[PDB]
Motif scaffolding. Structure first.
Motif, PDB file in Angstrom:
ATOM      1  N   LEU A  44      60.944 -31.058   5.811  1.00 28.30           N
ATOM      2  CA  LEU A  44      60.181 -29.818   5.732  1.00 28.30           C
ATOM      3  C   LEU A  44      60.634 -28.954   4.561  1.00 28.30           C
ATOM      4  O   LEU A  44      59.814 -28.292   3.913  1.00 28.30           O
ATOM      5  CB  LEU A  44      60.321 -29.051   7.042  1.00 28.30           C
ATOM      6  CG  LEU A  44      59.559 -29.620   8.237  1.00 28.30           C
ATOM      7  CD1 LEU A  44      60.131 -29.067   9.538  1.00 28.30           C
ATOM      8  CD2 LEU A  44      58.073 -29.312   8.109  1.00 28.30           C
ATOM      9  N   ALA A  45      61.934 -28.962   4.252  1.00 32.90           N
ATOM     10  CA  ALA A  45      62.435 -28.178   3.127  1.00 32.90           C
ATOM     11  C   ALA A  45      61.881 -28.660   1.794  1.00 32.90           C
ATOM     12  O   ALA A  45      61.875 -27.891   0.823  1.00 32.90           O
ATOM     13  CB  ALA A  45      63.963 -28.202   3.122  1.00 32.90           C
ATOM     14  N   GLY A  59      56.212 -22.641  -1.323  1.00 36.35           N
ATOM     15  CA  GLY A  59      57.227 -21.722  -0.851  1.00 36.35           C
ATOM     16  C   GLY A  59      58.661 -22.082  -1.180  1.00 36.35           C
ATOM     17  O   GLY A  59      58.970 -23.222  -1.559  1.00 36.35           O
ATOM     18  N   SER A  60      59.540 -21.093  -1.026  1.00 34.91           N
ATOM     19  CA  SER A  60      60.982 -21.259  -1.058  1.00 34.91           C
ATOM     20  C   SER A  60      61.506 -21.440   0.367  1.00 34.91           C
ATOM     21  O   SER A  60      60.806 -21.194   1.355  1.00 34.91           O
ATOM     22  CB  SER A  60      61.646 -20.027  -1.692  1.00 34.91           C
ATOM     23  OG  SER A  60      61.299 -19.887  -3.061  1.00 34.91           O
ATOM     24  N   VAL A  61      62.767 -21.850   0.463  1.00 37.07           N
ATOM     25  CA  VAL A  61      63.412 -22.170   1.734  1.00 37.07           C
ATOM     26  C   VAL A  61      64.714 -21.392   1.824  1.00 37.07           C
ATOM     27  O   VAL A  61      65.410 -21.214   0.818  1.00 37.07           O
ATOM     28  CB  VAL A  61      63.724 -23.679   1.812  1.00 37.07           C
ATOM     29  CG1 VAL A  61      64.387 -24.034   3.140  1.00 37.07           C
ATOM     30  CG2 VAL A  61      62.471 -24.485   1.589  1.00 37.07           C
ATOM     31  N   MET A  62      65.060 -20.951   3.032  1.00 35.17           N
ATOM     32  CA  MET A  62      66.407 -20.491   3.340  1.00 35.17           C
ATOM     33  C   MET A  62      66.946 -21.359   4.464  1.00 35.17           C
ATOM     34  O   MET A  62      66.234 -21.621   5.444  1.00 35.17           O
ATOM     35  CB  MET A  62      66.403 -19.006   3.722  1.00 35.17           C
ATOM     36  CG  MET A  62      65.876 -18.128   2.572  1.00 35.17           C
ATOM     37  SD  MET A  62      66.057 -16.364   2.838  1.00 35.17           S
ATOM     38  CE  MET A  62      67.833 -16.188   2.678  1.00 35.17           C
ATOM     39  N   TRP A  63      68.179 -21.836   4.308  1.00 33.14           N
ATOM     40  CA  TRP A  63      68.760 -22.834   5.203  1.00 33.14           C
ATOM     41  C   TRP A  63      70.106 -22.329   5.701  1.00 33.14           C
ATOM     42  O   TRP A  63      71.006 -22.071   4.889  1.00 33.14           O
ATOM     43  CB  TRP A  63      68.949 -24.166   4.461  1.00 33.14           C
ATOM     44  CG  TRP A  63      69.333 -25.314   5.336  1.00 33.14           C
ATOM     45  CD1 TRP A  63      70.423 -25.398   6.174  1.00 33.14           C
ATOM     46  CD2 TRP A  63      68.643 -26.559   5.455  1.00 33.14           C
ATOM     47  NE1 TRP A  63      70.430 -26.614   6.819  1.00 33.14           N
ATOM     48  CE2 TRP A  63      69.355 -27.347   6.388  1.00 33.14           C
ATOM     49  CE3 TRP A  63      67.484 -27.086   4.862  1.00 33.14           C
ATOM     50  CZ2 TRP A  63      68.937 -28.623   6.749  1.00 33.14           C
ATOM     51  CZ3 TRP A  63      67.080 -28.362   5.210  1.00 33.14           C
ATOM     52  CH2 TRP A  63      67.806 -29.117   6.146  1.00 33.14           C
ATOM     53  N   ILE A  64      70.248 -22.211   7.022  1.00 30.36           N
ATOM     54  CA  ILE A  64      71.511 -21.866   7.666  1.00 30.36           C
ATOM     55  C   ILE A  64      72.033 -23.104   8.383  1.00 30.36           C
ATOM     56  O   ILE A  64      71.354 -23.655   9.260  1.00 30.36           O
ATOM     57  CB  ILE A  64      71.351 -20.685   8.633  1.00 30.36           C
ATOM     58  CG1 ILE A  64      70.858 -19.453   7.867  1.00 30.36           C
ATOM     59  CG2 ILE A  64      72.674 -20.417   9.355  1.00 30.36           C
ATOM     60  CD1 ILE A  64      70.482 -18.291   8.747  1.00 30.36           C
ATOM     61  N   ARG A  74      70.191 -35.956   0.117  1.00 29.13           N
ATOM     62  CA  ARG A  74      69.016 -36.340   0.884  1.00 29.13           C
ATOM     63  C   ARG A  74      67.794 -35.544   0.444  1.00 29.13           C
ATOM     64  O   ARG A  74      66.694 -36.101   0.332  1.00 29.13           O
ATOM     65  CB  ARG A  74      69.298 -36.169   2.376  1.00 29.13           C
ATOM     66  CG  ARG A  74      68.153 -36.584   3.250  1.00 29.13           C
ATOM     67  CD  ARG A  74      67.764 -38.036   3.046  1.00 29.13           C
ATOM     68  NE  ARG A  74      66.947 -38.458   4.176  1.00 29.13           N
ATOM     69  CZ  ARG A  74      65.928 -39.306   4.112  1.00 29.13           C
ATOM     70  NH1 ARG A  74      65.566 -39.852   2.957  1.00 29.13           N
ATOM     71  NH2 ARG A  74      65.258 -39.602   5.221  1.00 29.13           N
ATOM     72  N   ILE A  75      67.968 -34.245   0.175  1.00 28.95           N
ATOM     73  CA  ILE A  75      66.895 -33.454  -0.429  1.00 28.95           C
ATOM     74  C   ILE A  75      66.429 -34.102  -1.723  1.00 28.95           C
ATOM     75  O   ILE A  75      65.228 -34.269  -1.954  1.00 28.95           O
ATOM     76  CB  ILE A  75      67.346 -32.000  -0.663  1.00 28.95           C
ATOM     77  CG1 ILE A  75      67.627 -31.272   0.659  1.00 28.95           C
ATOM     78  CG2 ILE A  75      66.304 -31.249  -1.472  1.00 28.95           C
ATOM     79  CD1 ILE A  75      66.432 -31.187   1.624  1.00 28.95           C
ATOM     80  N   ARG A  76      67.379 -34.458  -2.596  1.00 31.83           N
ATOM     81  CA  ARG A  76      67.009 -35.046  -3.880  1.00 31.83           C
ATOM     82  C   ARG A  76      66.197 -36.321  -3.685  1.00 31.83           C
ATOM     83  O   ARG A  76      65.190 -36.533  -4.373  1.00 31.83           O
ATOM     84  CB  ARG A  76      68.255 -35.308  -4.726  1.00 31.83           C
ATOM     85  CG  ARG A  76      68.942 -34.054  -5.272  1.00 31.83           C
ATOM     86  CD  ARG A  76      70.081 -34.434  -6.216  1.00 31.83           C
ATOM     87  NE  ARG A  76      70.910 -33.288  -6.577  1.00 31.83           N
ATOM     88  CZ  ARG A  76      72.051 -32.970  -5.968  1.00 31.83           C
ATOM     89  NH1 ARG A  76      72.509 -33.720  -4.975  1.00 31.83           N
ATOM     90  NH2 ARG A  76      72.741 -31.906  -6.359  1.00 31.83           N
ATOM     91  N   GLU A  77      66.616 -37.177  -2.749  1.00 35.41           N
ATOM     92  CA  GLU A  77      65.904 -38.430  -2.517  1.00 35.41           C
ATOM     93  C   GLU A  77      64.489 -38.170  -2.025  1.00 35.41           C
ATOM     94  O   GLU A  77      63.515 -38.718  -2.554  1.00 35.41           O
ATOM     95  CB  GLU A  77      66.685 -39.280  -1.512  1.00 35.41           C
ATOM     96  CG  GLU A  77      66.041 -40.611  -1.177  1.00 35.41           C
ATOM     97  CD  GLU A  77      66.833 -41.393  -0.152  1.00 35.41           C
ATOM     98  OE1 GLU A  77      67.198 -40.825   0.901  1.00 35.41           O
ATOM     99  OE2 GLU A  77      67.107 -42.583  -0.406  1.00 35.41           O
ATOM    100  N   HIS A  92      65.377 -24.162  -5.011  1.00 38.72           N
ATOM    101  CA  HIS A  92      64.557 -23.299  -4.172  1.00 38.72           C
ATOM    102  C   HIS A  92      64.912 -23.395  -2.699  1.00 38.72           C
ATOM    103  O   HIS A  92      64.126 -22.954  -1.856  1.00 38.72           O
ATOM    104  CB  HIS A  92      63.077 -23.555  -4.428  1.00 38.72           C
ATOM    105  CG  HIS A  92      62.700 -23.358  -5.858  1.00 38.72           C
ATOM    106  ND1 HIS A  92      62.734 -22.124  -6.469  1.00 38.72           N
ATOM    107  CD2 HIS A  92      62.337 -24.243  -6.814  1.00 38.72           C
ATOM    108  CE1 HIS A  92      62.384 -22.254  -7.736  1.00 38.72           C
ATOM    109  NE2 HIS A  92      62.138 -23.530  -7.971  1.00 38.72           N
ATOM    110  N   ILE A  93      66.080 -23.942  -2.381  1.00 38.05           N
ATOM    111  CA  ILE A  93      66.645 -23.907  -1.037  1.00 38.05           C
ATOM    112  C   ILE A  93      67.899 -23.054  -1.123  1.00 38.05           C
ATOM    113  O   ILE A  93      68.902 -23.458  -1.730  1.00 38.05           O
ATOM    114  CB  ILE A  93      66.970 -25.307  -0.502  1.00 38.05           C
ATOM    115  CG1 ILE A  93      65.703 -26.163  -0.420  1.00 38.05           C
ATOM    116  CG2 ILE A  93      67.672 -25.203   0.858  1.00 38.05           C
ATOM    117  CD1 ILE A  93      65.986 -27.649  -0.210  1.00 38.05           C
TER     118      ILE A  93
END
Ligand SMILES: CCc1nnc(NCc2ccc3[nH]ccc3c2)s1
Length: 220
Positions: A44-45, A59-64, A74-77, A92-93
Motif C-alpha cells: 500500500l505504501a 499521495g505521500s505516506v507516513m509510517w510508524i 522491500r519498498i524498493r523491490e 515519500h515515505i
C-alpha cells in the motif's frame, strides 16, 4: 471530500474491500506471523503513490513502526516491479520508529504537522500506517489490573487516528494480532497463498479473497 480508495495490488482483495482501502477510515488488518499483513502495508505504501488511474491517490505516506518490521529494500523491490522509481518512492515515505506506547501516541499527535505541511501540495499525505497498533500496549500493560488503562489509552490513540483520517482525507492502515475500524483477518491458504476475510463491516458483506505475495508485493 469524496472517499478515495487505494488498491491493495490484488483484484480479489480490492473487490472484497469495495475497491481498495478507504480514506477517512481506519482499516485494521489482523494476522499471525507470515500472514501477509506487513507485506500488505509495504504494498500500500507503494500503490498510494500511483495516479488514480493505476489505483493510487498521488499521495505521500507516513509510517510508524513499532517492532522494526519496515524493510526499505522491500519498498524498493515493490516500487521497481511496479514501474516506479524506488528512490523516489522511499523519499515519500516518512518513517518513524515508535519505541514505546507513549512515544507511539506522540508520533500520531505530531504527525499532524507534516500532514498540514503537505496538505495542499502535489503529494499530500494519503496513507498513515501503524505497524503495529498494539505491540507496545500489549507489552506494557500486563494483566487484568492493567486492562482498563490499556483500553483507555488505545481508545484515545484510535480517536487521534480517526481524526486525522477524517479531517485530512487520509487512509489509516494499522496491523494487529488477535473500534470503528474495518477489520480484515489474514490467514494461510493452500499452496502458499493467503486468505483475507472481512468481518463485521457495517456496509460491506463478509467474504474472503485469496492473494499471493510476489516481487510486486501483493497481487492475485
Ligand atoms: C514524538 C517525537 C517526534 N519524532 N518525530 C517527529 N516528527 C517527524 C516525523 C517524521 C516521520 C514520521 N512518520 C510518522 C510520524 C512521523 C514524524 S515528532
Amino acid at each position: 471530500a469524496t472517499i478515495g480508495r487505494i488498491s491493495t495490488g490484488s483484484k480479489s482483495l480490492d473487490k472484497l474491500l469495495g475497491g481498495g482501502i478507504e480514506t477517512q477510515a481506519i482499516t485494521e488488518v489482523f494476522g499471525e506471523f507470515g500472514s501477509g499483513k506487513t507485506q500488505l502495508a509495504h504494498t500500500l505504501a507503494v500503490m498510494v503513490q500511483l495516479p488514480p488511474e493505476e489505483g493510487g491517490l498521488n499521495g505521500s505516506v507516513m509510517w510508524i513502526d513499532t517492532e522494526n518490521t519496515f524493510r526499505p529494500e522491500r519498498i524498493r523491490e515493490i516500487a521497481q516491479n511496479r514501474g516506479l522509481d524506488p528512490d523516489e518512492v522511499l523519499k515519500h515515505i516518512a518513517y518513524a520508529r515508535a519505541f514505546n506506547s507513549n512515544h507511539q501516541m506522540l508520533l500520531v499527535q505530531q504527525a499532524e504537522d507534516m500532514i498540514k505541511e503537505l496538505l495542499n501540495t502535489d503529494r499530500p499525505v494519503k496513507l498513515l500506517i501503524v505497524d503495529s497498533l498494539t505491540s507496545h500496549f500489549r507489552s506494557e500493560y500486563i494483566g487484568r489490573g492493567a486492562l482498563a488503562e490499556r483500553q483507555q489509552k488505545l481508545a484515545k490513540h484510535l480517536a487521534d487516528l480517526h481524526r486525522l483520517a477524517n479531517l485530512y482525507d487520509i487512509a489509516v492502515f494499522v496491523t494487529n494480532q488477535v473500534s470503528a475500524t474495518l477489520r480484515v483477518y489474514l490467514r494461510k491458504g493452500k499452496g502458499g497463498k493467503r486468505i483475507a476475510r472481512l468481518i463485521d463491516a457495517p456496509h460491506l458483506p463478509e467474504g474472503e479473497a485469496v492473494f499471493s505475495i510476489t516481487e510486486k508485493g501483493i497481487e492475485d
